[model samples]
Target chain A: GSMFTFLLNEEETLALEQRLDTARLRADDALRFLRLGEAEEAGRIAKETSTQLRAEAPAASVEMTGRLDGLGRLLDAASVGYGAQSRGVLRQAVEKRVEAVTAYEKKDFAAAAAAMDGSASLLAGIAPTRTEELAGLWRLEKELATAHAAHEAARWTRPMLSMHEQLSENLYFQ
Target chain B: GSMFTFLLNEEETLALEQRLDTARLRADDALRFLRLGEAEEAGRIAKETSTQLRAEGQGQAPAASVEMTGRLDGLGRLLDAASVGYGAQSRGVLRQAVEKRVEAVTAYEKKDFAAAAAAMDGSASLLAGIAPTRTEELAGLWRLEKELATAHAAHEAARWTRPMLSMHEQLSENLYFQ
Candidate 1:
């Protein structure tokens, strides 16, 4: 038994490495003060409300993962050239969405909301948008709705992550 | 502006370390071999989790945290107290209650009516009786609840997480918690 696959050459690998490096720099920047004990670094980021996370992570991610199984289906509804990577991202987005939904429901609104908006935006990009894919999409969306309802009910226990605190010099100091 | 806060002593600090360790352990297990792909030892590390992650054009690392364990008001009160060593004993009891809820959920799936019933007999344990001084602590309980739900739902999402696979394996084996 033989499998047909071509190695991703050195050039592609190198380019991918560069892209990953830049991403690392950005990640390091974003994480400035979010560490367990870095108040100064966190204060330096964006200087805005938690709303930015929605743009970072989207709400759509939750719905896509409600029942994100079946690679056969995903394969049939994949992208032109980057199906594998797309599916992997699809899984991560869905996973984050699920985590966000539950976080929201338990009143960890900041974490849940951040995860929701953050994951959704990305997931929608790599997601299946065809008519046939709607069934799975709808099911996942409904579950996310349930989570949202839970959030509004004050089920979450943590302060929702806000990009803006509405007050300057107002950083969390331990 | 200066914020004044009381500092924990040596004994209390050790206590806090233990509680936080316990709470975090739940999250750590979620990312163990069963949940994550066994790429390499390096891959399972927290740094690796963030390094491998990519969404849209953004990147996240340890910044991406695991869903913690519950969404109830009582749960947060318990965690805050547990973290500070202010109410260690009660909080430890509370953690057990959280574990009970999980066991109960599994029992329900097993159709073990008696076991499930017994498990839920003390469901009121994690609820908050004393009002919270800080809104954040109140929020913590809810966050724990949401984390628990999120953790469970992910497993239920598909045959992925180890817990879900175990659930299936248990089902086939006619497993019952003694």
Candidate 2:
């Protein structure tokens, strides 16, 4: 479920976007080296990319945790003035927030990002008046998606590049 | 002593420039690979660049030879209508053309592109009055100079990049945390 379409603040967004862009460039160079049959060089760059992603994860998780906590407090105060069905939806949003934290703790960043996105979507549904507050969560969610995608690209390319190196080595000896 | 500066024919010059540009790109990639510590990749690309330059050389030498021969015949005809000092200068130009041919042959055989380019340039100077016909020689000389510069940049960078790679590896062993 998704409803928001407003743009995120550039000042906050550009830093994360720049980091992801750097990672993407590293991934691109790794793929280029792999195509050129330089597997060791590709692997080195891929490892650097992974390290960069890992460095980003902690800050992202912290920010998401803070946002979810703040939203929960808002829901708690607002539920006192709402009906039963609305209260149930608020409970579901809380559960989603808990799921996000658990996934983040396990270092499953993509799953964590998805959980946070789902939590924010649920919040947007029952708390339409709180869209301004949820905007920050949406911005963080988008950054997490970008970071996860960049990390996965490098991770997935690394093994295939290594496999190619192994096959080429085997062919040389035979 | 070069004097010809007229533009070469676009149809002829563009093709050679395109080939030289391609070789330059290969050399650039080779240097990039070297900087990244991929010595074998760099060497492979550099060898391909050298082969590309070699192919260009044969066509270049043949064209210069033709231009030089035509200019020598022109000089022979012009000398009969000249004063003694003017005829002597014409003979000097002929001698320069012969020297250029010898230098070009040796340079081509040795795979020394810059030397071959120097010889072609000398031939262009001796054949100055024949600029229209000598355009091909000038174009070839320019292409050879570009090819030699590109090849030299890659070659010279290779050893330096290797040294940098070793130092970086050593630094990583000593201080790399992540």
Candidate 3:
């Protein structure tokens, strides 16, 4: 199970909250840039936020680590289908995480943990239904790849529909 | 017309924004405490924030000073609006306190730290009775502001502002991200 109780002292807590805010701001900015079709600027902001998320990872408490991991995945997902690398070794990471969810549903906890190693550790509770986020992440990756090959499907495609919708929409509002 | 465009370097802009946020948080807390029927804590938070707002006011430009002054007015307005439920407090008392605070601000601007300190001490003491509360907690906040004003007059008053800045910084941080 994801550890719920990593206690952080005052200073560390402040630092982590600041990091999270900055990362969130960065992610929001990246999305804004993408909507404007400033592809270069959008890509730039996504990469920067990922760098910021990683910088805080080593210092975050275990509970805070879960938050950081989710944020990282969100940014990584953005990069998957959007950034300079349309498709490459980047998909390798997503494929591994796909196994993680697959193993998770199969009730093979260790397998889930193993596949999720470089990604979010499944034991970390309170994960935002991140697999859904990855779906858009992968779907966009695929769409971009098809577009790069100039395929007919690519001509009619768009990024994951409702890619910007809040998670709770798919959760309780269902 | 006020200088809408200040020539502050990057650091100065950051410093000004910090002052604004500190002042903002204090006003917010003071209102919160007052609404909760904790006049002493409300006065304390309000008083310290006012002190901080004044200290930064000394270094700001005319336009920035106007902004800072408006914030102080906004704080007073917030207090007046909230004090309706607590007790029948006098507007005269608050007006007197505002006068002294203005005196302190003007004196400090002229580099007359002693006069500024005296006036600010007067400003703080007037509130002792105005912000009525049962406990002694609020006294410390007012007391610190008066001391900081005196330190400014004594010369080497960086420590004066420093203490509250640190206190408020820690307080704002705790109140904020938590």
Candidate 4:
């Protein structure tokens, strides 16, 4: 399997997994801070974890480290724009997102899709301060759920984008 | 003088000055777009200029180039928020501060710290929103500005507001960090 091909041996694989877990913990903390509207603090943690992953990557593969690094940048980008939105709307979206991620982690694709749908609906209902931001998250999460469900196997081990990157790249969201 | 000690040669100095002018032009465009509530465009321009300055600074002037480059980066973040909406009052102060920067540069040339502080205070008061802690701290700074201005009018102004200039630099540094 491609996964095990990337892994060396039992103890080495276990060590790599632990490093990934630590990175995930830091990234999760960053997301929580971002949802709470402390973007500077959130950005700080996300960047720290990203650097940590890169530092540990010499013992692992750049492919694994870079996926998480991309996610960290995504969080870093989100922390910048998170401070300006209405707290109620931001909270609702973040809650739905948490649910989606949780379900995705459990490999409960049906629940993940449902949560993503709800999150999209909530975002669409908001006033259009950031239009594509709402749409991008919905589309990305929806598509990821669909893709994962169709696959024979999947892991919550990779991140392709962050919520804030959607807004940063797709500005002029009228 | 120490300032002259950092100078580049004939062609390099001219080239650097030309590049500096280009950065300033971009920064002005960022401010204008920001005022027009086109924050996305404004922020984009501001950041691009900052990047260009840093690249130019790598092989050239550290003292002059990097400081203005940092200011543009700060302006980039401020312009990002300008898209959402701030009060017209807040917007006015922001514009005033942006303008006072050019004025402050001239005052700085003449070694007039009072005029420079006035401009610096205007910039910081408006820019305080970008940093949460600075917003509260700026209230005290604003009162100080008021007192300092009065002292200047009454002929008591000199080095009293130097600390205020340093505070503004700190706030601007935080913006670049963002």
Each model's TM-score, in the order given? 0.21, 0.21, 0.25, 0.24
Q: Pick the candidate with the highest lDDT.
A: 2
* Model 1 misplaced regions, further than 4 Å: A1-174, B1-10, B13-178
Candidate 1 vs candidate 3: the TM-score winner is 3
Against the true chain A, what TM-score does chain A of candidate 2 give?
0.36
Top candidate by TM-score:
3
Comparing 2 with 3 on TM-score, the higher-scoring candidate is 3
Report the lDDT tens digits of candidate 4 across residue range B11-45. Answer: 65457546666665666566566546554565566
Q: For candidate 4, give the lDDT of residue A151.
A: 24
Off by over 4 Å in 3: A1-174, B1-27, B35-37, B40-88, B131-135, B141-178
Ranking by lDDT: 2, 3, 4, 1
For candidate 4, write residues A106-153 as lDDT tens digits. 766567656655654564434354444434433332222232232212
Cα error, residue A111 of model 1, in Å, equals: 23
Residue A111 lDDT, candidate 1, scale 0-100: 77
Candidate 4, residue B109: how far the Cα is off, in Å: 43
Give the alpha carbon lDDT tens digit for every residue of A1-174 in model 1: 553322222454344343333222222222211111122322233132122222322244443233222211222222211233466765675676677657756767667656655554444445344222223332233333433443333311222112133223255632
